Design a protein around this ligand. Structure first.
Ligand SMILES: O=P(O)(O)OC[C@H]1OC[C@H](O)[C@@H](O)[C@@H]1O
Ligand SMILES: O=P(O)(O)OC[C@H]1OC[C@H](O)[C@@H](O)[C@@H]1O
Lengths: 808, 808
């Protein structure tokens, strides 16, 4: 009974207000205060100094209540403005503050007034930021691998970690006051003549400062809700505000009672975590499961609320998550097209009750979905947990919201995740509780460390280019791991010798990436403790230490490998026309590539490369499994390493692979020279594990075939897959059953990680590229998340216009 | 064959030049550079940043060669000037820089020019110094115990640690280059994907920077030795300088060959360790044992050198140790009268060879002693290792140098130390290798952490005052550990109930002292790694971490308990006239003490206290063993604690007691109100474990009897004992045998820790108080060390005139 076409004047009023905020400003309050507190409390341990900085900023910053919201709590002085966090870096800010209103798709209105506040702070943080200090440690060799871009890790060096969901049931069952009580018994057991206890109490001291200021904050919003009602003349909203301060008074301290309370609270947390740290992908976890016992109480039974005012609340909320904005560098902005935050909300899945698995779909799962389908907004990121025994009813209701052309909902697959989690050591009832984090990755909400994916980026295409030409990276002229065999010298005797070169080179860029990651993570852990986040994850409080120090019950991280499709395609093409057939010569190719297929003779060569050799995504086994092998070397490397939290507390403490590379395929391509699959220099790579655009000619069931052949179980950082259909292709009920049997076959027979759809027509993308001004709420799906189309650059825009359009 | 009366014009020229440096200046170079490097390398790990600071300062500072020295290497731009080290503190410097040329016995000429350099640096170090940060951590309660002075620890909060001897045999066997080789193999085994190895390599990186700059420095003194010989016209010294650059060239790199080389090298180290850190009591250890194989080669056999030019070299050296100066606060200066450095040189003892103990006295032991006896200088601090089988010849030669009236040599006692070391876990052949450190304490040179004594000060007299009056400290009006029983309320039922109050109060000031020490030591270990010192102690290089982190093979520390005599005397007096006899009333006493024995009635009361009750030091068992018990509570407390290095590497990791309190008895007295032993308010306490001045009336054999009854074995921080005789009392050979049988009986029958003599007449102390100007090389012994008498304040001067003068 899905009524997906009807908003309300209240929420239509807001959503538009926001989508027209087309060049956001830069609220600078937090970088003002945090410098003060770092200047006033230089003598404190960093966990306490940071707890003060936050408690200061929290009660000296502008707060307001616009748009007649049903949910309240702003990230910044000005609407949709992006705070400034100087602890992680200043370097890209001391290069780029003039050049910021005109930045191809990451433009920030930087007021002459708030620019004054920036020249003032900045030069003091120089030398003492995470990024500055990473460079204080890096070995010289590490420093070159970074300059080139072969291994990239800007995102960890210029931002907090985040990439997790905190323990929202805890927060709800105890309320803040019950966490002070948790903290109090814990510092009751501290002994100050025991080294480890001496450090443990600084971190516990810090937690209490933060917990405190947060209660105070919730009350200084109960404050406004009444000081506003004073000078307010429209009765109907005063009766709302009075209930909100009435509802905020009760959530600043005790466990919440209603639905309106248990969802304002969880937002309050979800916010402060993004004011204390700029890490993106603060997820929500299984919200349809932990807000449900209030939805049931309130509106299903006692019916003191109406199932339609529940759906209106969430909306206000969804729009507050849209309010959350964040500014990134010029370089990293390219790989994060459309300033996203990836705040993920998870619905569905199973639920291990007393040892037996049980369908977890419930009436709030339908209410949450149906509220997303009506709103058509980038936020939240809606991720649905499929399982073999999901209803036909709910899956059809998922296909209904897909035909709404904003990319949601996306799918994750209990059929693959749960058995692999159990298989790593995760507690069986925790493996059933996994959520989506950020984009397509998966963790156990409330019990996992940071970055279940999101660690360092490796460029598979550039590395393979080096395995072909004597270890030489053509982009930068460097040779980091020398070797004799190169194409230009045509002295590979057989293809297996090319595959060896690959196994040899990647084994050395993986070591480096881990050495680099070891520095970053160690700098992040000495300088920037996330106080509140750590309070709200198990088992920090009991171990009295931050997540980065080993506070989390579980801890697994993944990197991101970019260039998947191009690696398969390249190897398979030099395998066929160079070795197998002799059609093309080693030097003839080497000269081809060092030339960017230039001339007319070299162009014929490229086209024989593109179409005279099997491409990944046509259910062709020869290329598909060649790719799985090439990747398998990388997965085999990660096994002889342990991440920095190994042995210091958590379970697991290891790595795995991951393809959730956001829009890094574009700027990563610009750094990759011509490649043997026929790709020209600088053009884009392929995003995620999707097929390279325009090479998949045997339709969608052949695509999922190819994708499902990758070693999914070792790639628990997510296997990203984009598909695009035309709106007329998915139109009748006969077309809907086609999508459904396609999904059910992906997840059950093939064991797929994820799939997300773009239901857009190719002319609509093209009128919005042209007339932005009548398309400023059009949502298209990028890769792991949704974006406002008019907001992406044109590089970003056309990668999305180039993708294959499939029939069902 | 001791010729103790003959210097040389060369060395007489120098010694006088120095003793007239009567208000020293403040060379500010090092605080200039170190701020630069902390400002240029803010991004480095602290171990590397500090290694740079040192390598910078080391090759940008004024260096010279005055006085026609046979040993070269200056601590500072100006002669006898005191560098400035801002890392440990600035606070006492931002209060006291105007008020510094007139400071009762710690006056520093602070040039208007070098005062300019101080206002410039200082305000940047604010908030980031050891002291500033300790206060960033201390619990509020900890902070009050500190304000009062009941527990004091200024010396650890405003200075490096030191209080050790580094591994001088190593340095000599390998030379610097062989330590680069040591360091190189060590970083060869580093793995940069292993957390502990990632930190290990920063510390190893740092060590190499320092090692390097030190070789460079030794060569930039080989530089001067020739650039001077150029513009030099007195042939005879050019032939010396040429050999010194000739000898410095060989010691900047390789293991030294001669005696002149092996003793210039060890000085070079002994110096740089006092430019990198301001910790005092950089000792030398068993120099008569590790320089001897060169003395033997050179002059005993091959005779290429003359036993009289060896004795002239050491002299130059002794005078370079006198050149070493250090500036301290206004408060801490009082407890360190006569700006000393306590650089200790140890001679004699035994020597466990292949499992059998053997006399270690040798011909360099006689040469070192005889060179001290001729020179009559505060530096070095000469400590002799007695054992039951020491010769009559060498002991008489020790008594000869005593009749020289400069306090040296002092005595330590293999008969007590070795069996207690073995008994703690120390390797048997290391227990035979123990040296003296600083004053009277004992450690295993090259294998021990910092502060075998020198940790936190406790005031036994003030604490006992609190056990008498309801936990009330009368000095400051505070009550830190409340209790009902007080004298003013006369409600002790029996004396055992007073002893309980004592056991209860001290058990609580000991906990606090350890909590305080835990903060200081942790701040010292996060902010101020001693690079070179750590390189030269086992087993830092192998564990790749500093001493403070657990680098040292062995690690035991002691505090200092001040007020020993007064505690015994007080308890024994309230035991006799209050309880036992009823002669005096509880309130009558309480009112007595709260009054500073004022009136004429209260004065009779005091005199019955002084002389109507047994005092410690008359071989009286009742008071002697009452004191040992009172102290025994404190020793029993230390057993349930472990110092911060417990479990992190070293052996032992524990505490023990100690009485080596330097001149803290005076300023500590000023903070202690009238006490039941008859002492008036503010007057001095008793220094060390000596008898309270003027209460020991049955002569020296009765004194050593009393002292020997203390629990010596648990007091391995040293039991300090001062004795003073008149020069005519120790004059004939019949008088010498009296001193010798007194010593041999102390150490063998009583098992004494230490004894040192003042052979001065009471009129000589009084003419030098009056006519300073004809007495500026008079040395008198303070407590653990020697001082120039005209340099001590008058408070200091008269504590020394008040001591008992004994007959033999
Ligand atoms: O380097 P960054 O921006 O921190 O990592 C980017 C990550 O953002 C979080 C997403 O869940 C993941 O798909 C993506 O890889
Ligand atoms: O607090 P400070 O000055 O570091 O300690 C003073 C110490 O100096 C080192 C001496 O060996 C010891 O006798 C004395 O107690």
């Amino acid at each position: 009974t899905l009524k997906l076409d009807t908003l309300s004047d209240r929420i239509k009023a807001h959503k538009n207000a926001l989508v027209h905020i087309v060049k956001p400003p830069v609220c600078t309050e937090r970088a003002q205060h945090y410098t003060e507190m770092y200047q006033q409390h230089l003598d404190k341990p960093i966990p306490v100094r940071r707890a003060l900085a936050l408690a200061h900023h929290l009660a000296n910053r502008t707060i307001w209540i616009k748009h007649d919201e049903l949910i309240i709590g702003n990230q910044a002085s000005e609407v949709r403005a992006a705070p400034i966090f100087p602890e992680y870096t200043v370097s890209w800010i001391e290069k780029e503050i003039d050049d910021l209103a005109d930045r191809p798709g990451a433009g920030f209105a930087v007021s002459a007034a708030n620019a004054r506040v920036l020249h003032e702070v900045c030069p003091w943080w120089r030398g003492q930021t995470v990024q500055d200090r990473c460079y204080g440690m890096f070995t010289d060799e590490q420093k070159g691998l970074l300059a080139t871009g072969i291994i990239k890790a800007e995102g960890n060096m210029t931002s907090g970690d985040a990439h997790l969901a905190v323990n929202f049931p805890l927060l709800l069952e105890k309320g803040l006051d019950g966490l002070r009580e948790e903290v109090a018994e814990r510092r009751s057991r501290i002994n100050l003549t025991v080294l480890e206890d001496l450090h443990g109490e600084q971190f516990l001291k810090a937690i209490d400062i933060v917990l405190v200021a947060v209660s105070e904050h919730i009350e200084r919003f109960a404050a406004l809700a009444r000081e506003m009602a004073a000078t307010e003349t429209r009765e109907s909203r005063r009766d709302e505000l009075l209930a909100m301060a009435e509802n905020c008074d009760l959530i600043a301290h005790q466990p919440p009672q209603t639905f309106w309370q248990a969802l304002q609270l969880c937002y309050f947390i979800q916010l402060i975590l993004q004011i204390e740290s700029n890490g993106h992908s603060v997820s929500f976890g299984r919200m349809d499961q932990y807000l449900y016992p209030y939805y049931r109480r309130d509106v299903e039974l006692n019916q003191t609320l109406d199932r339609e005012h529940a759906i209106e609340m969430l909306h206000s909320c969804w729009l507050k998550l849209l309010e959350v904005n964040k500014i990134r560098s010029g370089s990293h902005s390219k790989a994060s097209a459309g300033s996203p935050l990836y705040q993920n909300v998870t619905i569905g899945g199973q639920n291990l009750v007393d040892g037996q698995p049980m369908d977890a779909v419930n009436p709030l799962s339908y209410a949450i979905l149906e509220s997303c389908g009506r709103l058509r907004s980038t936020q939240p990121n809606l991720s649905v947990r499929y399982h073999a025994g999901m209803s036909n009813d709910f899956l059809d209701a998922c296909v209904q919201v897909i035909r709404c052309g904003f990319g949601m909902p996306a799918f994750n697959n209990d059929e693959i995740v749960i058995p692999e989690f159990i298989k790593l050591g995760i507690e069986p009832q925790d493996a059933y509780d996994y959520a989506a984090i950020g984009c397509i990755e998966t963790a156990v909400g409330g019990k996992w460390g940071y970055r279940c994916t999101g660690m360092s980026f490796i460029n598979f295409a550039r590395v393979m280019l080096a395995a072909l030409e004597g270890g030489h990276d053509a982009t930068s002229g460097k040779v980091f791991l020398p070797q004799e065999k190169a194409l230009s010298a045509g002295n590979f005797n057989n293809f297996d010798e090319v595959m060896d070169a690959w196994d040899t080179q990647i084994r050395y860029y993986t070591r480096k990436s881990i050495e680099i990651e070891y520095v970053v993570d160690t700098m992040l852990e000495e300088n920037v403790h996330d106080i509140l986040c750590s309070a709200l994850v198990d088992d920090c409080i009991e171990r009295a230490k931050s997540i980065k120090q080993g506070g989390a019950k579980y801890d697994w991280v993944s990197g991101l490998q970019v260039g998947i499709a191009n690696l398969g395609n390249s190897l398979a093409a030099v395998k066929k026309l160079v070795f197998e057939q002799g059609a093309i010569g080693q030097q003839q190719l080497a000269a081809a590539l060092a030339d960017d297929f230039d001339g007319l003779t070299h162009e014929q060569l490229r086209q024989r490369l593109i179409n005279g050799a099997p491409k990944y995504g046509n259910d062709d086994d020869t290329v598909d499994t060649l790719l799985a092998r090439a990747y398998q070397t990388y997965i085999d490397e990660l096994k002889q390493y342990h991440n920095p939290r190994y042995g210091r507390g958590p379970v697991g403490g290891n790595y795995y692979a991951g393809t959730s590379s956001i829009s890094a395929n574009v700027p990563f391509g610009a750094q990759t020279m011509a490649t043997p699959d026929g790709r020209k220099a600088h053009t884009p790579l392929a995003e995620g594990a999707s097929p390279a655009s325009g090479t998949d000619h045997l339709g969608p069931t052949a695509v999922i075939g190819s994708v499902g052949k990758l070693p999914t179980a070792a790639i628990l950082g997510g296997v990203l897959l984009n598909q695009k259909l035309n709106p007329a292709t998915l139109e009748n009920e006969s077309d809907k059953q086609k999508l459904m049997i396609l999904l059910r076959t992906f997840f059950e027979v093939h064991k797929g990680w994820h799939i997300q759809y773009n239901i857009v027509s190719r002319e609509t993308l093209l009128d919005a590229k042209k007339h932005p001004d009548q398309y400023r709420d059009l949502v298209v799906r990028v890769a792991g998340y949704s974006a406002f189309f008019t907001a992406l650059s044109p590089d970003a825009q056309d990668d999305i216009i180039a993708r294959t359009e499939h029939m069902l």
